[PDB]
Amino acid sequence: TQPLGVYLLTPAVQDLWLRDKATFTCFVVGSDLKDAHLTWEVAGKVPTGGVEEGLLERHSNGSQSQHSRLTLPRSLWNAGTSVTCTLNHPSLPPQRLMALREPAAQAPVKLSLNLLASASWLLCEVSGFSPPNILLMWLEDQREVNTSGFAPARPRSTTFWAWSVLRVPAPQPATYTCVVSHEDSRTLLNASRSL
Amino acid sequence: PSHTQPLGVYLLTPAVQDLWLRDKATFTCFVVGSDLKDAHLTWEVAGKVPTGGVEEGLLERHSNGSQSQHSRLTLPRSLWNAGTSVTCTLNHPSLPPQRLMALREPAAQAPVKLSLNLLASAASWLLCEVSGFSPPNILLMWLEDQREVNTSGFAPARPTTFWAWSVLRVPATYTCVVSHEDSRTLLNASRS
């Protein structure tokens, strides 16, 4: 019998902020994915549209990968919609994965952006959220920036907190925006500070 | 007859903490697959078999039908520091020998120098700057006295050479240790 590893990837900040869309990616890794198929369910219904099945991929090591993508309007995401991918293979019982707003999940209360030194160093902080899985993005006049150093989420508390430092070269004035998406508590924070 | 299986071999290189705290360089080599009974991971140090220090691992079995087995080879830091060529090989009967090499690559620029200072100042914030190296594969570690502190924000390298930087947040002597694998180079700084 073949092993099958199926994963469900939640949408990234870039899709949710720059494109007003939430793209869920569900892919199975296997030895022979011919008759293994991925089905979708948005809030318990088969999707009307927005599903774009990927192509089967042979791999050098003998494994095979096939993926399927589902795109939701960001409104459905912030509302807490449930997305359920299913892996159906005739040799195995069905394997469902789910990305849903968790009742036990705390939204990130506050996001704080200020400056720390002068090349300028911009500090973005977000606190009061759980689970600790966090996604952060930096932007420079609606254009994405990557020169950042992100500190993963660290702990009296029920929550976690994280921060990322962005260093921008000393040069035109600019406004920097820090966007954070907590996925299990479908929040999308965003802040602007200017220099 | 018989049909072959998916077999994926991987090789981990020593970590900063391993070299800086223990003076030992452990190379973890493992293979992921379906039926790993006839899969034997073998080592070569400097191009010859190691006399000792190899810990073959039990066959891990995962909840998705995959099997995994890891063999690790621990070397003195001096051996790593010298540039000793480490090699892992997967020997399955119906498959070719698959070798993953952890060499000191000749074309690998080594980190020029390491910088450590204070970025800002309730808590305070440090910096660590590693400059002029390639490939960008690099590992960092902060230490409060002889104790590791994990409250850093690391910025991986972006583009002749590369440079990365890490900001540590502190609530002592703070040392930043840098490990560059391809040029078996290790650098530390210190501050107070």
Ligand SMILES: *[C@@H]1O[C@H](CO)[C@@H](O[C@@H]2O[C@H](CO)[C@@H](O[C@@H]3O[C@H](CO[C@H]4O[C@H](CO[C@H]5O[C@H](CO)[C@@H](O)[C@H](O)[C@@H]5O)[C@@H](O)[C@H](O[C@H]5O[C@H](CO)[C@@H](O)[C@H](O)[C@@H]5O)[C@@H]4O)[C@@H](O)[C@H](O[C@H]4O[C@H](CO)[C@@H](O)[C@H](O)[C@@H]4O[C@H]4O[C@H](CO)[C@@H](O)[C@H](O)[C@@H]4O[C@H]4O[C@H](CO)[C@@H](O)[C@H](O)[C@@H]4O)[C@@H]3O)[C@H](O)[C@H]2NC(C)=O)[C@H](O)[C@H]1NC(C)=O
């Ligand atoms: C069924 O499920 C099982 C369970 O997961 C699946 O098994 C997994 O299979 C995948 C196969 O792709 C493996 O991924 C590879 O992993 C290696 C290394 O893995 C290390 O890191 C993992 C993640 O660690 C982080 O997360 C964990 C949380 O789980 C956390 O605890 C940890 O602290 C850390 O934060 C570890 O999980 C893993 O530990 C496991 O294995 C240990 C050894 O066996 C064992 O001691 C542990 O107890 C544990 O069991 C391990 O520490 C990745 O390196 C590798 O990615 C390389 O390869 C891909 C190609 O696929 C490439 O795209 C990447 O860029 C990367 O390439 C590097 O390596 C190449 C050499 O192989 C080199 O040529 C490249 O240049 C690059 O090298 C760079 O870095 C290295 C540094 O070592 C340096 O040498 C180079 O110079 C250069 O700098 C894969 O991602 C999983 O590890 C494996 N999981 C387990 C638990 O075994 C199975 O696949 C599923 N089956 C199916 C059908 O789906």
Ligand SMILES: *[C@@H]1O[C@H](CO)[C@@H](O[C@@H]2O[C@H](CO)[C@@H](O[C@@H]3O[C@H](CO[C@H]4O[C@H](CO)[C@@H](O)[C@H](O[C@H]5O[C@H](CO)[C@@H](O)[C@H](O)[C@@H]5O)[C@@H]4O)[C@@H](O)[C@H](O[C@H]4O[C@H](CO)[C@@H](O)[C@H](O)[C@@H]4O[C@H]4O[C@H](CO)[C@@H](O)[C@H](O)[C@@H]4O)[C@@H]3O)[C@H](O)[C@H]2NC(C)=O)[C@H](O)[C@H]1NC(C)=O
């Ligand atoms: C033969 O070689 C192939 C190719 O290298 C191997 O295929 C790889 O298999 C591994 C095994 O799991 C896959 O790792 C998984 O990756 C998940 C996300 O991957 C994303 O990032 C990677 C790297 O950045 C990208 O390459 C991927 O993009 C590829 O796939 C998309 C979709 O098809 C394509 O569009 C792209 O072009 C690429 O082709 C992805 O973007 C990762 O989340 C996952 O980690 C979860 O699972 C492990 C268990 O293995 C947990 O330890 C871990 O904590 C995570 O678990 C949490 O998260 C998941 C959701 O992510 C939840 O479901 C869990 O419940 C839990 O919350 C895992 O690491 C790898 O993606 C895949 N590579 C490719 C290119 O397909 C074969 O394995 C190999 N065969 C053998 C036998 O060795």
Ligand SMILES: *[C@@H]1O[C@H](CO)[C@@H](O)[C@H](O)[C@H]1NC(C)=O
């Ligand atoms: C980010 O968008 C939110 C909507 O939730 C809004 O309240 C806030 O003013 C925006 N941030 C900035 C800096 O404009």
Ligand SMILES: *[C@@H]1O[C@H](CO)[C@@H](O)[C@H](O)[C@H]1NC(C)=O
């Ligand atoms: C790193 O630490 C060792 C031992 O503490 C010391 O000998 C060495 O001089 C340090 N590195 C530098 C660049 O001074």
